[PDB]
Point group: C4
Chain length 470, copies 4
């Protein structure tokens, strides 16, 4: 139970802007002494979970996030064949070495430039008959003709190492190298992958989230319509480690029926359901058979949902109430409030959530499946909720005649596309993960907690007026 | 009675920004299962009522809103002959087929272009000896000389159908048509009207608001000065289905006298009176003989009325108090707070109002009586409270000498003209009605209410601080 | 005592933005039935008092405000000879006819143009041997050479009338006149003054504030330093009807001594003292012998005083407390909070103040003593707290050596000059008085009060959160 | 204990924007009757203390602030030799005459121009064989060739006086001088220093803060890592009058150990420790042996610390609680909230703090160690937290291998450089000190306190809503 300062008993619900953490006595000497592992059974070693948004949940996203201890949920409308392919690709990745962008010496320079932005490494490795022959950077290919080929651009001077060497040794090798990328190769000499100098440190900081067979974890979502049981069984057979039953309004008859149908199969996977913002809804979802309840409905005071309907709840009070209700029954809750700062993750963990769902914030990253765009000032940006609308209408395309599609489409708003600018200092999602984990670790050291359960047990909170925001 | 979360007992009055709806358990599968019909005796099938503003309350407005289940109140100062003409025109319209813009082949192309914007259809039908001969669109007439005529512009290729055919068939016919407008014709072959492809769906979604004789409903307002009884009797004889006695300050001796005078005639129509913001005023207006009390005085914290006088009340608390007071006596209340988002309509219905009055928001539509204007960036806009001031001074023109007109005009502010921009995606008022009804239906599904009485009975509300708006 | 809605008991002090008036039952048919006369013994017929600011308190200001029922306080540092001259000039004015700008036919056209802006009439009357010979307008003199004279510009076609004729007749005469100014002349035929067509109505609306001898009233301020008794006696002998002892911090030993010294003389005039924001200070000032207590210290949350020192109080709570304390002893209070909207005057009167002090708001008027300036966009503006600083340092100039002047001047901020733009529709102060009185009368009709005592006795107030300002 | 108005019991923590001071009865005739001396044993005569920030804590800063009664804390990472040199330089300065910028006649004019901005005097004195030969101003050197020398620019007409003359006489001598700088010289005729005409008044207003030997006071900071005892002993031997043990999070085991280690040496100096925001932390720090507790953690609602971690406390409530806790044990507290207006200093003193720490606000001054920069509009500005980052990484440079430096540097944000513009009217820090002391003295006169203890004993405070900030 979250403790509050004496006399702090507001007559209203609290947002993240209404509360602050009071520093306690702390024995935690450094941020590295803090263990961020979660206990909700999701197997993540960091509290960050990536939302099942088409503009965010890519295969590159899944690999990169799972390697650092997070987990990514695949969108519900992805075809089962694509789901199986993505799961196999993710579970075939290495736990330490990142999968690089690779190029044959015959591809156009323009295609190489376009593919260069698909990863945070900033350099591609040219491959010939399965062997690496040179590196190519942005500045190298940028100064050549539009119709030039890769062959006469790559430079053969690059650092290389066998797989399995100590990442500290890779860091030492790259100290004076002109390029921050070392190529790791199998003992057969075939291309195995690349390590960035920062990646060697990250491999020591972050523990990968792996299943019982030592492969990277991944999750998949299901809709509340159709044969939910068959879809859940198919996804479980495809190798998904966790299932999310997602709808805009949990705590309705269809969700209870879907949760019962999925639980009857006894797949043995953790089952996530949401969203709800009340203790009664959390109790109903847990009794129906869900193990984890996803929390959050119309969180913002000026969000689309609340401006359309007036329905919602401030995130902090909802998370507190739902976490208390779930812990009463031995369940766990996920915060799905639309995190935008590390403060939100820290406060959600303090309120009692076991994990935090991050959505459009990760859209503005290289590893997101969307293509890179440039503004008038050539600043890189990506469109959140852009082409993904097609997938939504795909769920309508399988439905009835165009008459019913237009009838259902009458009471629907236009696409809420958003310009997510990429941070030049934090273009890669690993930088955002570093930012968030740094904030959480600092919060734990301020409270004096060695782990998240201690953070929830020992935190003290106070309430501030709006006048401090003037 | 509206229920509030435990401990939510503020020491102040609440606006729409101070409250939110908490989702309950819901059996409502879809938004189409929700019945939006009102019980206040006004006969509307949607809670939307259009305010008696000269810049909004047109005959096109009345027809279009009444066809979709709303109702429009005519301004108080309209002459009785114009009132009778408008009532006859509205009650001669068809319940399904919309009245199109029509042109003879001899009118100038410029006049056709000017008239094209008077409806949301975007195309006019050329008529000769009562028969349709072709369609004309914006792009067709835009590419021709300023002095060209309609004759040599119209194209004879258009879809046509007899009146009374299934709107689904009209939708099917228009699927591959180059123009989204089908011409419906009487069996005699004379022009009967047009259906837009969206109109065919809307005719299945919305039930028209009709009187006992099956004609579209309309209402008219009366002032509190002069012979109120004679004016009310004249308007009732003209065929108005509902009477609104309107003044800026209800709960005064003149309003009580006027309500008594109108009720003494026993016209049998519902009688609306306002505005008041207190339970005592609602009780007085109901006891005087009013059936419906219109609520709202200086709603906004920075409105003209409150900046001039400091008089007003936040809309939510006023609506709650007045609705409780009226339901104690078996009356009903209308919310006249100046709706700007569907959230306001939903919250007004939750507070206990039976209907909602919408004013200047509908000014920026094609069907509004004002003429279209274009900004420097050629964006379409209309002037709210523009030429309508003349009508106001018309009430002064019938009065005393210019000396008294200037004396009374000394303590009066200038005209509060406003630039209401037209939404390119929602240029027609039917799009705004779709927006509002979508918001209300979503609110009902979130609460789990099949109808508005259930919405008022089952809603749960919470209070938020201002800090969430930072 | 101000009544509040049930449960409205805030744990903080209230500003004007925190409160609203709730409309009561009202028998007041029209705004003209409301009597705005004050009972504090100041003799004003409207609650407006003009602050003793050098940039505002001019002789034109005093005449124009006193004619409409207000009163103006002369600055404390004005020399006694100038005070006597201004008092004689004000008390020699006519109660109905305004003193016009007059020109001899030999003055330069440029000087005529410069003097034209000194009054709201917009036209000057050329005088020769004490007789009027023609009118001159802005547009007439604007189209002529920079060195032209008045003689060959004036037009002899103007409306004229004897003094004492009914203002309604003057209104009738001016109805079709090309110029809105009628020249009133004594029976000897000498120039007596002018009436603007609006002035004829204002003369029927507003009752002038006159002393026992039927001359216009005026007040003068004294400082708390030096021989306060001698200065007060000199000002009383000069004919000032009311004395204001003013300092930035009332409720200090020097103020008590000064009030005792002035009261010992038994001049028989009302005595104003301030400022204080506490009941204890009001009691002390009244017991010392003051009849009226001026209320307000650092009213704004971001004013200079509060940003410098953190000292102040919200205006509404201070006025309520001080008015209650003063009425306990039979005194009265003046609100000196820096009015900027008519809402502030209405709320100050509702809280219990008998009069309201208006300062820099009136600076942006023609009748203010400052000269007209024009921005880059040629918009007219005036500098509040501009040259007046000299007068302040004049109080330092009479003091000690330049060493002490610099020593005292070390702990002083720079001049807080402000750009007060003139409203094109309200360039004259009479328009601002009309605005304020219209707001107050509307408030009285909403409450249902025929006079200010009834307004204080019957008003009901509520409290709103800050969320309504989002 | 701070007293609050009746009924003011908020359910939240208060910032400086939430509270105001209510004027009491006051016998303090003038601001000069107020004694600003502190009782915390730091020996300052004004409550201003300068933070140990590299961008602020310079030797010029230390001299100028100590001469006016303040004190400056040297950064923790400054080498001990530089600390000793700075302490000797500060303790060799004169108590009245300021150390001028001096130039030999052979230096380039460009170097003279660059050095001219290092002091607020605005003029340099050319020295030859230890004797003054002329003055040089900005305008003089600005109109000459880029390669010109000082020799042929200096003007020999300057005012001179022997050291020890009455500052009033120096003021009199400078009254009609063309240059506001008088050169004070030893009886041997060698250059001793300069007095600005304002400095002569300031020398009478401000009493210098001096140790038992009559030399200017200075303080030095220590880190919580390494051998804290050895560093403290070295700094005490170097002549530092006060020691500050500083870390971002006080109330942790390492701080308790460091305080115990420093107190065991029994150096006899006052010991400052922070930061904490709770009474428990203050009690722990005092019991460990600290004499003064520095208060403030994440003060702003949108500061970097709170946006990263959600950890902090509003400054007012924290200062009140910590001051009460410390006075219970006979300690004192310093407010380290990031002062930006004199209101903050006054409110911190009212809450119960004995001194106030001022940081980046003083960065935008001539005496700050940073170099002057000019914006596009040639406005002078300085970079707060610019090159100082190097010093931080210097603490990392002495550490482990580059691997550990990068590992620790992963969880660190970029430099928070800020553009601190220099006020043209307040370019020198003495002007800012005058501003702050004027605000504090005005607060004391409003409360009616002759000294800071009376200010804390007699102040009355009220609480305001956020609505006043609209």
């Amino acid at each position: 139970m979250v403790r509050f300062l004496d006399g702090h008993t507001p007559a209203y619900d609290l947002t993240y802007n209404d509360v602050f953490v009071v520093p306690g006595r702390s024995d935690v000497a450094s941020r590295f002494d803090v263990d961020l592992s979660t206990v909700d059974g999701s197997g993540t070693t960091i509290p960050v979970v990536v939302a099942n948004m088409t503009a965010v949940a890519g295969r590159r996203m899944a690999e990169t996030v799972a390697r650092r201890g997070g987990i990514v949920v695949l969108p519900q409308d992805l075809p089962i064949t694509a789901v199986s392919e993505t799961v196999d690709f993710v579970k075939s990745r290495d736990l330490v070495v990142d999968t690089p962008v690779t190029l044959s010496p015959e591809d156009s320079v323009s295609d190489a430039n376009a593919l260069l932005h698909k990863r945070a490494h900033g350099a591609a490795v040219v491959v010939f008959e399965g062997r690496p022959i040179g590196l190519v950077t942005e500045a190298n290919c940028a100064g050549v003709d539009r119709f030039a080929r890769v062959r006469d651009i790559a430079l053969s001077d690059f650092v290389t190492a066998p797989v399995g060497t100590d990442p500290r040794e890779v860091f030492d090798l790259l100290e004076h190298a002109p390029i921050d990328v070392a190529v790791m190769t199998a003992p057969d000499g075939t291309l195995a992958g690349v390590l960035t100098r920062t990646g060697a440190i990250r491999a020591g900081i972050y523990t990968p989230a792996v299943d019982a067979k030592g492969r990277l974890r991944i999750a998949a979502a299901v809709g509340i319509n159709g044969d939910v049981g068959a879809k859940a069984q198919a996804l479980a057979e495809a190798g998904a480690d966790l299932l999310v039953i997602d709808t805009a309004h949990g705590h309705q008859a269809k969700m209870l029926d879907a949760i019962k149908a999925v639980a009857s199969l006894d797949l043995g996977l953790p089952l996530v359901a949401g969203n709800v913002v009340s203790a009664e809804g959390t109790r109903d979802l847990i009794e129906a058979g869900a193990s984890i309840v996803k929390v959050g409905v119309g969180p913002g005071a000026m969000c689309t949902t609340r401006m359309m309907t007036g329905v919602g709840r401030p995130q902090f009070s909802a998370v507190v109430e739902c976490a208390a209700a779930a812990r009463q029954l031995g369940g766990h809750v996920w915060a799905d409030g639309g995190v935008r700062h590390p403060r939100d993750v820290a406060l959600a963990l303090a309120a009692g959530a076991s994990n935090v769902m991050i959505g459009s914030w990760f859209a503005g990253t290289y590893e997101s499946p969307g293509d890179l765009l440039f503004d008038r000032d050539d600043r890189p940006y990506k469109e959140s909720y852009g082409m993904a609308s097609k997938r939504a209408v795909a769920a309508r395309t399988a439905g009835d005649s165009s008459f019913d599609r237009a009838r259902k489409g009458l009471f629907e708003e236009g696409i809420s596309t958003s310009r997510m600018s990429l941070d030049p200092a934090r273009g890669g999602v690993e930088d955002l993960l570093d930012h968030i984990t740094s904030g959480v670790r600092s919060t734990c050291t301020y409270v004096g907690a060695a782990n998240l359960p201690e953070l929830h047990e020992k935190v003290v909170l106070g309430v501030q007026s709006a006048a401090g925001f003037a």
